[PDB]
Write an enzyme that holds these catalytic residues in place. Structure first.
Site, short mmCIF file in Angstrom:
data_model
loop_
_atom_site.label_atom_id
_atom_site.label_comp_id
_atom_site.label_asym_id
_atom_site.label_seq_id
_atom_site.Cartn_x
_atom_site.Cartn_y
_atom_site.Cartn_z
N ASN A 78 25.49 -53.78 -14.98
CA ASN A 78 25.51 -52.97 -13.77
C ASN A 78 26.12 -51.59 -14.09
OD1 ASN A 78 25.99 -55.99 -12.57
ND2 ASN A 78 24.29 -54.91 -12.19
N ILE A 85 28.43 -47.06 -11.60
CA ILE A 85 28.63 -48.36 -11.42
C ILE A 85 27.76 -48.79 -10.37
CG2 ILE A 85 30.14 -50.33 -10.83
CD1 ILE A 85 32.39 -48.22 -11.61
N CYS A 86 26.85 -49.64 -10.41
CA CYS A 86 26.19 -50.07 -9.02
C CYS A 86 26.86 -51.51 -8.50
CB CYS A 86 24.53 -50.64 -9.65
SG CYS A 86 23.47 -51.32 -8.12
N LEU A 87 27.60 -50.99 -7.46
CA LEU A 87 28.13 -51.99 -6.86
C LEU A 87 28.63 -51.72 -5.53
CD1 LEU A 87 30.66 -54.21 -7.07
CD2 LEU A 87 32.40 -52.67 -7.07
N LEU A 120 21.44 -51.47 -14.04
CA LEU A 120 21.61 -50.07 -14.41
C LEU A 120 21.54 -50.13 -15.90
CD1 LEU A 120 24.45 -48.48 -12.59
CD2 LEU A 120 21.94 -48.17 -12.20
#
Lengths: 145, 72
Positions: A78, A85-87, A120
Site C-alpha cells: 500500500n 500511502i493508500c489508506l 501501490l
C-alpha cells in the site's frame, strides 16, 4: 490559532496515551509539520523494523486531511516509491475527529494487514502471500535502502 | 510540580525519539512552546531544565555528546 490549539491538544493526548511502537513530534518550529515513528508490530514481518514519516497539516485542517508520507523507504503493498500511502482514512474516509494518534495506529495496523486489492506496489502485493520470502526480501532491502 | 516534571520527561523522550538529537536550547524551546504555553500550562526555566537533563545523563536515561542530548 484554533488549529494550532487543536494540534497542541493532539500532541498532549499522544504523549499521555503510551501506545506501543508509535510516536510523533512537531519538527522544529511549526506545529504544522511533524515527524512520526512507527515500529512494526510483534508477530508481523515488520517486527524489528522502524520507519520515520512526515505529517504536514494544511490550511483547513482538521477538515482537510493531513499529508502523511513515509520518509524511510517502506516496501509494502500500500506504499508507493515516493512514500505515499493508500489508506482510506487519509482520503475519502477522513473524519475531522481523527487525530495524530489515530493516524499512527492505523498506519501501524496497515503494516501487518495490507489491502491487496488496492496496491501501490504490485511486487510487494504479489510477494505478500509468501511471508518467509516477503520477510527476507523486506529485511535485506531495508538494509540496502 | 511532580506531574509537571514527569510530563516534561515524557515529551523529552518523544522529541528525541523522533528528532534523534537536540541541544539544550532546542529542548527548552520545544517545552516552552508545547508544554509551558501548551495545554498543560506547566512552568520551567532553563537552569532547572539543564539540571534535570544532567540528572538524566548521570542515571544513563540520557546521553550527552558533541554538545547535544540523545536517547541511549
Amino acid at each position: 490559532g484554533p488549529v494550532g490549539k487543536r494540534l497542541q491538544q493532539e500532541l498532549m493526548t499522544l504523549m499521555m496515551s503510551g501506545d506501543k511502537g508509535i510516536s510523533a513530534f512537531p519538527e522544529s518550529d511549526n506545529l504544522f509539520k511533524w515527524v512520526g515513528t512507527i515500529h512494526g508490530a510483534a508477530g508481523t514481518v515488520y517486527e524489528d523494523l522502524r520507519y520515520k514519516l512526515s505529517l504536514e497539516f494544511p490550511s483547513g485542517y482538521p477538515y482537510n486531511a493531513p499529508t502523511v508520507k513515509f520518509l524511510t523507504p517502506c516496501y509494502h503493498p500500500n506504499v508507493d516509491t515516493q512514500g505515499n500511502i493508500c489508506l482510506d482514512i487519509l482520503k475519502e474516509k477522513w473524519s475531522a475527529l481523527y487525530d495524530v494518534r489515530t493516524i499512527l495506529l492505523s498506519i501501524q495496523s496497515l503494516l501487518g494487514e495490507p489491502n491487496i486489492d488496492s496496491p501501490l506496489n504490485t511486487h510487494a502485493a504479489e510477494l505478500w502471500k509468501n511471508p518467509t520470502a516477503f520477510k527476507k526480501y523486506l529485511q535485506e532491502t531495508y538494509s540496502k535502502q | 510540580k511532580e506531574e509537571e516534571l514527569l510530563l516534561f520527561w515524557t515529551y523529552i523522550q518523544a522529541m528525541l525519539t523522533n528528532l534523534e538529537s537536540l541541544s539544550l536550547d532546542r529542548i527548552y524551546n520545544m517545552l516552552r512552546m508545547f508544554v509551558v504555553t501548551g495545554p498543560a500550562l506547566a512552568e520551567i526555566d532553563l537552569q532547572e531544565l539543564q539540571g534535570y537533563l544532567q540528572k538524566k545523563v548521570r542515571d544513563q536515561q540520557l546521553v550527552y555528546s558533541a554538545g547535544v542530548y540523545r536517547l541511549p
